[PDB]
Amino acid sequence: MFENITAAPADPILGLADLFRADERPGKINLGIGVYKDETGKTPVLTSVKKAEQYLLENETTKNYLGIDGIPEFGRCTQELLFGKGSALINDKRARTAQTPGGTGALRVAADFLAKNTSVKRVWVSNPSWPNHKSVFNSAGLEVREYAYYDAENHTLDFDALINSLNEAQAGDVVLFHGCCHNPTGIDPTLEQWQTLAQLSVEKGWLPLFDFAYQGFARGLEEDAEGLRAFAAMHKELIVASSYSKNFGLYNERVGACTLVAADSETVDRAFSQMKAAIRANYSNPPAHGASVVATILSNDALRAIWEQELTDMRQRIQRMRQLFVNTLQEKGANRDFSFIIKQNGMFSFSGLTKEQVLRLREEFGVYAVASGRVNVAGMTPDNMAPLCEAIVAVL
Amino acid sequence: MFENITAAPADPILGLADLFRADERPGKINLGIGVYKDETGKTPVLTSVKKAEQYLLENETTKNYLGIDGIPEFGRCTQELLFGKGSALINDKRARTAQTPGGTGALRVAADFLAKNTSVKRVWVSNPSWPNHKSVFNSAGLEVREYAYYDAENHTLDFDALINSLNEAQAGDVVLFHGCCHNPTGIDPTLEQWQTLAQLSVEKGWLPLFDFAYQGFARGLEEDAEGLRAFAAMHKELIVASSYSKNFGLYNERVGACTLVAADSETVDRAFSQMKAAIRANYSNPPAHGASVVATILSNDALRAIWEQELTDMRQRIQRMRQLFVNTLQEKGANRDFSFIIKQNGMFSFSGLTKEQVLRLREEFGVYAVASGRVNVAGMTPDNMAPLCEAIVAVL
Numbered sequence: 062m063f064e065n066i067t068a069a070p071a072d073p074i075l076g077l078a079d080l081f082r083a084d085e086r087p088g089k090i091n092l093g094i095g096v097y098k099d100e101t102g103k104t105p106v107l108t109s110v111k112k113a114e115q116y117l118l119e120n121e122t123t124k125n126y127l128g129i130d131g132i133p134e135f136g137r138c139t140q141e142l143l144f145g146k147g148s149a150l151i152n153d154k155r156a157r158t159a160q161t162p163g164g165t166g167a168l169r170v171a172a173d174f175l176a177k178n179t180s181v182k183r184v185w186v187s188n189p190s191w192p193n194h195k196s197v198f199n200s201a202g203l204e205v206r207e208y209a210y211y212d213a214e215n216h217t218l219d220f221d222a223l224i225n226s227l228n229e230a231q232a233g234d235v236v237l238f239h240g241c242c243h244n245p246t247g248i249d250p251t252l253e254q255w256q257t258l259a260q261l262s263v264e265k266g267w268l269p270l271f272d273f274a275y276q277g278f279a280r281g282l283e284e285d286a287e288g289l290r291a292f293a294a295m296h297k298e299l300i301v302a303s304s305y306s307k308n309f310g311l312y313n314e315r316v317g318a319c320t321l322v323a324a325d326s327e328t329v330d331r332a333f334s335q336m337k338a339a340i341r342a343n344y345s346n347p348p349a350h351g352a353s354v355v356a357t358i359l360s361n362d363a364l365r366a367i368w369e370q371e372l373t374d375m376r377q378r379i380q381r382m383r384q385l386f387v388n389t390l391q392e393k394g395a396n397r398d399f400s401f402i403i404k405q406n407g408m409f410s411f412s413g414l415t416k417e418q419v420l421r422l423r424e425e426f427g428v429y430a431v432a433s434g435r436v437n438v439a440g441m442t443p444d445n446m447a448p449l450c451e452a453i454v455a456v457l
Numbered sequence: 458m459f460e461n462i463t464a465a466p467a468d469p470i471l472g473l474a475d476l477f478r479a480d481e482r483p484g485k486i487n488l489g490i491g492v493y494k495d496e497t498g499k500t501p502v503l504t505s506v507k508k509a510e511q512y513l514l515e516n517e518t519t520k521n522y523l524g525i526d527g528i529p530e531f532g533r534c535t536q537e538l539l540f541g542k543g544s545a546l547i548n549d550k551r552a553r554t555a556q557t558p559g560g561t562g563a564l565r566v567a568a569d570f571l572a573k574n575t576s577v578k579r580v581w582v583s584n585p586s587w588p589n590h591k592s593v594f595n596s597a598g599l600e601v602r603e604y605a606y607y608d609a610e611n612h613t614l615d616f617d618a619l620i621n622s623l624n625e626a627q628a629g630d631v632v633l634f635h636g637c638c639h640n641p642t643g644i645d646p647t648l649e650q651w652q653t654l655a656q657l658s659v660e661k662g663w664l665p666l667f668d669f670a671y672q673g674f675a676r677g678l679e680e681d682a683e684g685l686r687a688f689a690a691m692h693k694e695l696i697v698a699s700s701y702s703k704n705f706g707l708y709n710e711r712v713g714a715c716t717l718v719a720a721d722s723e724t725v726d727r728a729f730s731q732m733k734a735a736i737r738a739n740y741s742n743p744p745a746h747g748a749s750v751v752a753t754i755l756s757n758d759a760l761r762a763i764w765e766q767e768l769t770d771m772r773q774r775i776q777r778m779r780q781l782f783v784n785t786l787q788e789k790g791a792n793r794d795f796s797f798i799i800k801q802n803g804m805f806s807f808s809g810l811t812k813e814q815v816l817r818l819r820e821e822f823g824v825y826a827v828a829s830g831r832v833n834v835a836g837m838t839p840d841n842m843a844p845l846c847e848a849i850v851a852v853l
């Protein structure tokens with residue numbers, strides 16, 4: 062049965078980790094995958110997380126199954142993070158949340174749901190976007206169309222092209238939006254642009270699907286949800302796949318959520334019952350650990366206070382790093398002007414390097430970035446900033 | 458988009474938990490879902506598990522991503538559990554293991570793999586079987602055909618009918634076998650019958666797919682793998698989905714594995730690369746916690762020793778319970794002879810009760826069993842044995 066199976070091509074993002082660890086050389090630098098690193102070049106487990114885990118070790122009495130949708134407190138907490146405490150979506154019981162194996166699992170359950178209970182056939186994903194978006198949607202049978210986004214020349218959000226591209230989307234089509242920290246550009250729409258997109262979306266009859274994997278890394282928890290909230294004020298239906306991998310440093314525990322919003326409770330309940338059907342045919346129920354950590358931290362005033370501070374520390378370090386990056390690039394003799402880097406949000410930055418430059422950076426200098434020229438700014442430390450910038454300049 | 462979505466029907470197994478918790482009444486008894494209970498009617502977290510978790514709390518330095526296939530030691534350990542330490546499958550590097558979100562996630566990744574890289578169109582599942590088998594396979598596009606298994610009259614394994622049913626399976630079709638503790642009958646093939654099935658399978662060109670969710674609950678770790686090992690000695694290719702939910706009491710942590718076996722390393726590697734492609738399009742990488750617990754316990758002599766004892770304790774309690782069940786049934790005045798219960802293996806027993814009897818048991822007596830008449834023997838305690846048997850007798 063397997064004699065003709067052809068070897069699959071490696072993921073541009075994940076296949077990178079393989080090559081890196083296989084690569085010898087002490088000075089090799091890894092600016093690939095979106096994982097946060099502190100001043101020392103480590104990706105530690107948050108203190109708030111260590112505290113919640115101890116609480117669980119001593120207070121957990123059973124590992125009995127969690128129920129299709131997961132931990133309730135967990136769901137209640139993400140809806141408030143996404144929509145705000147007062148929010149009418151919460152008060153009118155228009156939203157349901159299912160705990161999932163990461164933001165990726167949230168996208169998949171959403172895709173499986175849409176493909177089998179809805180008349181959706183195509184999903185619109187930005188150009189450029191996280192490579193794994195198309196793979197997830199394609200796996201459920203949906204087709205992926207692309208819309209313009211980034212203006213490579215000015216390094217801006219080409220809104221006209223965005224609008225003009227989306228004008229080809231039909232009523233009933235899904236349009237995937239990045240909540241904040243657009244991967245891999247780092248460029249996000251303003252509140253004005255977000256409201257405009259909201260209006261357009263309501264007139265054209267598109268189903269908004271927000272991917273929120275970096276809430277907290279641009280401006281703040283509440284600020285980063287401004288766009289989504291603008292959409293939720295106008296739409297009767299929307300789906301949101303959120304992740305707690307980055308803002309909680311819970312990468313390998315797979316903590317995410319798939320929130321479904323409908324015109325009313327009665328409707329959302331019927332729709333959600335089908336979503337739970339898609340989950341049962343996939344993994345049954347979700348992994349408790351990482352999600353219990355998130356809920357215990359969010360449900361406790363002291364623990365949440367410590368967490369929120371840890372998060373702003375991460376955000377601010379990233380911001381110090383991209384600033385240092387630009388200066389050191391100019392200082393080291395880079396000919397091109399990379400000031401636009403300071404204008405981007407999140408863990409990355411679209412360096413604007415060519416595929417060949419990225420290849421030489423790796424082969425010749427052990428510096429690892431994604432073929433698209435995306436580099437993890439959060440992987441830069443004051444100690445690797447110099448050799449890194451020298452490698453880059455010797456390739457421009 | 459969601460105004461026409463029809464409410465999905467509840468899972469016969471999981472929808473049962475809902476009704477039970479919603480049901481008031483103190484004396485309500487739950488013999489539905491396959492979760493182990495101790496003498497006190499609790500489903501505690503194993504001591505070996507509590508110890509491994511502490512070890513992790515103090516020794517874990519990061520939550521950085523785990524890699525598509527998960528923890529390596531984990532994979533090495535399950536292959537030895539499944540195939541034995543000396544095993545040629547291990548020595549010749551013919552097998553690859555991917556860590557998955559439970560045994561259910563293992564079945565799904567296997568189905569997604571088969572549907573997209575193989576020419577399989579139909580999967581053969583026993584009659585009766587775990588309800589969720591068809592749902593998983595159907596979700597990937599495969600079709601499910603059923604083969605005869607249980608002889609309701611004699612309460613035996615109708616081997617002739619099994620053979621005769623499978624004679625309609627074509628070369629290239631998948632045949633799903635339960636490693637041990639057949640859900641829900643509890644009847645398993647002998648070693649002779651397992652070897653016969655192995656021969657037949659090789660001549661007809663079927664792809665064996667073993668579901669192993671109860672290794673350790675019939676006779677023992679090694680004994681329960683006798684059938685699979687008989688198949689692995691003869692087949693060049695097979696897939697096995699195993700679970701650590703029951704034997705490790707890790708239900709809500711979602712710990713399972715999908716092991717792929719091919720004619721040689723080179724082949725298995727190419728096939729596995731596609732399996733990793735299916736995983737990436739689903740949840741990316743698996744949840745670390747439950748799997749790190751399994752690996753830490755299996756990698757440590759003392760911890761494993763304690764675990765193995767805990768497992769035999771569970772197995773033996775279940776065996777004391779089904780014996781008490783039969784006696785108390787006869788003692789309480791049951792007309793039918795339920796001695797066949799003592800002949801079954803695992804956590805369940807096919808009571809042989811009718812759909813109506815099961816319904817009256819619940820509605821009238823608060824006793825919860827599956828509509829098929831399957832009852833969780835591991836949910837019986839010396840304290841609920843009396844009222845339980847009285848309810849049953851008043852319904853025969």
Ligand SMILES: CCC[C@H](NCc1c(COP(=O)(O)O)cnc(C)c1O)C(=O)O
Nearest residue numbers: 074094095163164165191244274304306
């Ligand atoms: C594995 C890739 C990690 C990272 N992208 C992770 C990621 C996810 C889902 O991640 P998770 O399932 O871990 O919650 C969703 N959405 C975006 C836009 C992402 O960038 C990157 O390299 O950009």
Ligand SMILES: CCC[C@H](NCc1c(COP(=O)(O)O)cnc(C)c1O)C(=O)O
Nearest residue numbers: 470490491559560561587640670700702
């Ligand atoms: C949720 C149902 C639990 C139990 N069946 C769980 C179960 C599984 C997968 O379980 P897990 O994903 O938790 O590893 C696989 N295979 C069989 C034959 C099972 O009975 C029952 O009620 O029979």
